[PDB]
């Protein structure tokens, strides 16, 4: 039986996105963070177009569609950037975009060196675990469905069924074989990898929120869409109204 789910994921996977960073200016806090915010804005456009093409996604209430996107973009973009870093520079640097690659100096200058280190460990996991492109696509799709309000969504029922289905699809393409233990071990590793994305996203969420607050004082520009989500949705996560869905406790 010819697969379909994976055909779709591979087909809709977003292409290359540039930050628009001018690599001629010195590496300053203001210049680096302003370019990261622009990349986030451009990437948010692809995240939306991508999500809309995902199987079952349009069957969610429009407001729930907005919500999962507003809540999970950080995790999605970090996971993807870790994959690019792993495949383009063997996780040696953070490959945010072709025109915005962070080396050690930029990690320090960004004032988020610790968070960059944690992102680099994430990227390296793709190597340590030997994550296949298929496993990567399925895990990334599941991240879209990994954060919701504690009060639930407008149509929680359908969301829970869609989430379930994306889990079964992940289970189906895990790299294993005559050895049920290997498959069991593999699923454990992948669920653990997905969970580890959340604490990273949370640090970045805290950082960007604080940055937005003092943006005028540190000369960091926030595009319209990022400004809006960072000032309305991100606080709901930081205040505990919206929480990640973990596999493990």
């Amino acid at each position: 039986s010819q697969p379909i789910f994976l055909n779709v994921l591979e087909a809709i996977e977003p292409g290359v996105v540039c930050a628009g960073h001018d690599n001629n200016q010195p590496d300053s806090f203001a210049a680096l963070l302003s370019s990261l915010n622009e990349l986030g804005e451009r990437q948010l456009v692809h995240v939306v177009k991508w999500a809309k093409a995902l199987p079952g996604f349009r069957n969610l209430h429009v407001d729930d569609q907005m919500a999962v996107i507003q809540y999970s973009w950080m995790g999605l973009m970090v996971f993807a950037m870790g994959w690019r870093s792993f495949t383009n520079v063997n996780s040696r640097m953070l490959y945010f975009a072709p025109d915005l690659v962070f080396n050690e100096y930029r990690m320090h200058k960004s004032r988020m060196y610790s968070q960059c280190v944690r992102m680099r460990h994430l990227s390296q996991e793709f190597g340590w675990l030997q994550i296949t492109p298929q496993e990567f696509l399925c895990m990334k799709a599941l991240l879209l469905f990994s954060i919701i309000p504690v009060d639930g969504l407008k149509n929680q029922k359908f969301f829970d069924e869609l989430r379930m289905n994306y889990i079964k699809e992940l289970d189906r393409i895990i790299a294993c074989k005559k050895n049920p233990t290997s498959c069991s071990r593999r699923f454990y590793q992948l669920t653990k990898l997905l969970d580890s994305v959340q604490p990273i996203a949370r640090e970045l969420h805290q950082f960007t929120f604080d940055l937005l607050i003092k943006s005028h004082m540190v000369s960091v520009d926030f595009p319209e869409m990022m400004a809006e989500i960072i000032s309305v949705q991100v606080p709901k996560i930081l205040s505990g109204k919206v929480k990640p869905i973990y596999f493990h406790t």
């Binding site: 456009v45 939306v48 177009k49 809309k52 349009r58 569609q65 907005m66 507003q70 309305v232």
Partner: peptide, 12 residues
């Protein structure tokens, strides 16, 4: 979130 809504509505 007007801009986000527009990106979702446009083409579907």
């Amino acid at each position: 979130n007007a801009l986000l809504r527009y990106l979702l509505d446009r083409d579907d």
